[PDB]
Subunit: 254 residues, 6 copies
Amino acid sequence: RSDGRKEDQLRPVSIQRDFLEYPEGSCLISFGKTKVICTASVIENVPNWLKGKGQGWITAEYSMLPRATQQRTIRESVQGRIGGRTHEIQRMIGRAMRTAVELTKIGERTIWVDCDVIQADGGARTAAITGAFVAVADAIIKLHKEGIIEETPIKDFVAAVSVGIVNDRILLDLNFEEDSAAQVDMNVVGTGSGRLSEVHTMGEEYSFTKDELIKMLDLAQKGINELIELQKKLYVIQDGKWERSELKEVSSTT
Amino acid sequence: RSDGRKEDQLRPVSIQRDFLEYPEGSCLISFGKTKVICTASVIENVPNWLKGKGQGWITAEYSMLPRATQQRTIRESVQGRIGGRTHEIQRMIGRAMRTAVELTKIGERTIWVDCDVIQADGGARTAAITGAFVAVADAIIKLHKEGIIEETPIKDFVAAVSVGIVNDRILLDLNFEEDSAAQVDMNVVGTGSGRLSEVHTMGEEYSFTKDELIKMLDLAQKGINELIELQKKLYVIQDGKWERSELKEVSSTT
Amino acid sequence: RSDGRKEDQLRPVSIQRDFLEYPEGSCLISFGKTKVICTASVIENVPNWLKGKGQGWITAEYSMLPRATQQRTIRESVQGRIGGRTHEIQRMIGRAMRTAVELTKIGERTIWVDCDVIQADGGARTAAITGAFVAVADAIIKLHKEGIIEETPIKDFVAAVSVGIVNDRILLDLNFEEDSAAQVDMNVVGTGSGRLSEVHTMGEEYSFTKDELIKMLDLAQKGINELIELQKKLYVIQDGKWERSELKEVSSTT
Amino acid sequence: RSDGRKEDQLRPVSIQRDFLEYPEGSCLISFGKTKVICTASVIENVPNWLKGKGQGWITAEYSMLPRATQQRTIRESVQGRIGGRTHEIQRMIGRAMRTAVELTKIGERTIWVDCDVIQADGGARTAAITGAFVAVADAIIKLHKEGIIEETPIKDFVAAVSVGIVNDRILLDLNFEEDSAAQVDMNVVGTGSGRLSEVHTMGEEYSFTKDELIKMLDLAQKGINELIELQKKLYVIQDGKWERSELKEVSSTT
Amino acid sequence: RSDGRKEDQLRPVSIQRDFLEYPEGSCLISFGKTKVICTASVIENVPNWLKGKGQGWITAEYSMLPRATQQRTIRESVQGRIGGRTHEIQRMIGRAMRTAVELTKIGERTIWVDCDVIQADGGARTAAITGAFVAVADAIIKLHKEGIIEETPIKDFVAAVSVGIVNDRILLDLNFEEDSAAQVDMNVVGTGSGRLSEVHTMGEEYSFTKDELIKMLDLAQKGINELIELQKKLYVIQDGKWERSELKEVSSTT
Amino acid sequence: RSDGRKEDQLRPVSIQRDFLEYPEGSCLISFGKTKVICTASVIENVPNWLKGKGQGWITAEYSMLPRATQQRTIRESVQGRIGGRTHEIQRMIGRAMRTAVELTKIGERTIWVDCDVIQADGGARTAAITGAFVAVADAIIKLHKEGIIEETPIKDFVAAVSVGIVNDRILLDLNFEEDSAAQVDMNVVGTGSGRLSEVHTMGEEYSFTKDELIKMLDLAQKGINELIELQKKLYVIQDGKWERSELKEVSSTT
């Protein structure tokens, strides 16, 4: 691989909590050169169709500053049209966060997750899901510490990683060049207990076999595990009670 | 199941070619009450970034008339904003068609695929991919018959189907009610030779196991096979030369 | 004329009711190659300015799939801007339906008419008005059959047709080529009892006389009559009580 | 009538040319309280589809300042959506101007007509067409005076007026109250030689007869004639050569 | 200067009140060739965040008809995107009007100010603020005359003017050519008692000194004074009670 | 002051260069809790109206992530309309950068400045201008180091600061609460040699005197000076040749 990395090897991973002061939860996560700021802010209100149903909600916003892969990613303001690809990803991130939280116990409020890619080199959305989780859990823990809610209703850790087939090679966590040159690529969202929340595999003008998929899904689940082992060092959990550990930052041994 | 259908059973399938006169290829496909008009029209031009590269292109447009699932699906004109969910699906359909065609041999022109859901009851996008293929192949065959191109550069059949877990039951081809009540749902795009082009599995606030995924992927591939056996009755193929058969319509035995 | 048609002759007309299962009323109408799907769906609600006034409402949506006149008609989603020409026509269709119905007796609900041109060769909006009526009446009859309303408050049949001057020839029901080459063209919306609901005549860089207008209006009213004679075979009416006849389809003798 | 006006009587009409200094042609026209500023500005360029075809073009922009009928008419900037009703009218005004001009002899340039309703009390679009003509002719005369073009290729005068049925009364030139209370209303665009360029009649939930239409069309043509007699005092024409007269303003005797 | 004007000299100024009949207040103001119609219309309602707080509100809309500086200024309707420069100015005009009025005493209603530049030659926004004031005061006086409100809660006159440095020359009230060629330009909004409401100075790729700014601010305040002396002839004020004078128009001696 | 800060005292300032790896220049600047990421990326191209004129260009994009002042600042994508306030600021930042650079010597390329407010507590736009300068200079220095251009055509340092009157107190660098409660507020953009590039003063329903303005402008220029003394520690300049110093970060003594 271009960076001397093994095929079943994640790039250097770094997760820094308390990145910003205002949000209830926030972090700066990095998978190699891909960097995303993830913030979780609490809005004391719920979407109109949820009022009264004794439940909270989580929703995400994703943005890719104009310097994606060292090119240009002009937003939606001073540009024009509103592409539905940002939306695909925000929906994904929203689904990952809600699966990890028992919204029943959050109260009628909303955790607004903001994922801001400040530098992209592939795997931006998977880095965003991995980081967003840290911000959401911290935010729920913060809400508890403030007496706003009774417990810390987090069900499990959630992380994500990309994987693909490049020159008939199965690689974990692809950078931007490995992914543009990929025949088949995939994104997997997994949980702490080894379960899956989401999986999308797309042949890029190539088709693949049930078996190649399983091989990719096995390499992804291992990546998800390593990423969750990292997240885990940020918390001290017992019988569903979550507290932050004293680590403000955790990185991979690489 | 609500309609007396088995768990590994597709709804009644119907594919009618030559549905409309103007498009080079067109059909009306139906998976139960879900109905989609799929047309393939040839534009003697290519997207700006493809000019000169001796290659054609395929792209799709998807629309869901305002009577989806017997509710309301107001378009993008007399409504306002432009959701990025229609775009997700058009991208999917585009990717499925391009994987099935050797664009190298199509010339510098574009096949414009239009998928119009005139009635929805779940599985609308998978019906659209299955139908769009028939329209694209017919369109390529038509182009050949007209001398516009040398061969019929179609690589293989492409079909799609949905599958999901409902009350811990794994069901093939979900209607709208089975899918709103699903814990996990999935869409699979497969090929004639049993390979896969795309797979998306989403936990709906539930997580699933690698094994449940495989079980779902096995039931999907069987559905894809039955759907492709149907498409196959519409063509007579030999050594990569495609001709339409005399069938104007094919349906499932149910 | 290009198709061997007389000057005071409509193209082959076909109206098929119960085209789709979900809408309260639906049909597929065709004036030659021009084909429009017309559906009438009931929304148990009214526009905000009508709440409380003991009255219902009817409104239309018009769309022209991207294969209009065998060219390209990219919608409003994956294209951009929202032209005000679709709106002109939806307003027209809305006005035609409301004139035909005693909204007082419909209750506080709205009949949402959807006109979808799946193939265009001129006269698309007039085919849409003619077809939309069939769907709206069927929908009102359906509502009655369900006990949702007391009577079938339909005042009269409504149909429409185009007419124009081409090479100083006055022609009824113009196809797409006859209309692009027209000096003057017109659209007329008439009723069962021979009255008029709307008339628009536009000189296309040519002016015309009061007399040429009357000649065109006379040829249109005859076309409207033939079209209404067709619609009439779809109903059995007595003292303002409407029932569908056993015909599921009616076509012209041509 | 509310203002003591006869039924076949236009409101007080006033047309003032040279209203503004920059445009090649400009005027302030008024039908009673309805006031419109009409400017014709020359752009030394043509729409992309007209390049090379040795012809000019005319196109219009219509806007209704936020004080229409003493209510609120918030534009398209600090409001949002872009209604297709402004577009209906701009298309109408464009069609009226082009019918009056031999574009062949204008050169490859465009006359950009701007109609700005600064006060509305019904008949705003007909006042705009009547006024726009004066601005376009003046602009063509100005172009000639400057040597930009050989002749003054204006074919004839163009004016417009509204008419309708209110309480079974046929009235000419309706104010805003007479038109909201109308059963049937109509707009007619006529020429100097008594011919017609456009006619639109709409039943407002009422239908009408061929004969009532003719009665309305006769009253309109008389209104068009009076309006054109006024425009005529602004020009001195001979064998197709147009010059402005010394009148800077012309009004009706009322 | 191009027009023989001194450096500390305003162009010919003209303010005409009662320009239109419907608005509670209206005028046509002109600074040389720059012409703006300013109307103040009362809406018996307040913005949602102001309901109940016993206060009124003032807000502005600004538009520049397509003939700005004898070029093209296509609006926001039949053009597309919505630039945030019109908004800058509307915000400015809104701020100037609200500073001049004791909203506490206006009641819960809104004065909707419309500024329409019908001809531009520089200084359009400053002419608009100067004119808008006249329309707002007249509108408040009108409201009083009608008994809608107790007093005429106007705090002071408000006017505005531009100034800049051109070829190291400090000029007051710049036309369009003097401003495109300016190294530094500025807009100042002042009050009757010599105070300031707003000031914006922008170096156009040139920087300036605190002292050059003061020199410009001194020349502006003198321009503001002359403009307010003109406005003053339109009113008769005593102990905060405002009445219009008998002047319908006031112009500068030039 | 709420934070124990003097009246002529800036909050703690921190500027960190090389914040990100991809952009030619980048930094994270902070004025207290207000934090902005500023990146300068080079596009080997120019705006269409500049082609051929032997000159480069600089333009800015500004965005305020949804957690502004601990509230909600939903962007322009998954929200809708495009406010013209972001545009006001991007124009300001663009003007500040271009004034500081001799575009003549940059070549025909564009420096694309991206300012991303990741946390806001007042003074976000002034922090963005101060930070953007550092990124642009670094980017120009980087371009030189790469041989893309001959020199480092930077004319001078550019910084900005806010100032206002709160309870008749003149304060430098306002936080969000001091600014919402301000009677008058101002933003000043200054240069290294003590000159000014821009100044905007707005009375917030209060007017002010020429003298209060000067007092505010004096306090601002002192703030600009302190900010520029900080920027200066990041460079080593001689006869117009710029090199970065070894500092990767500089902060204020507070």
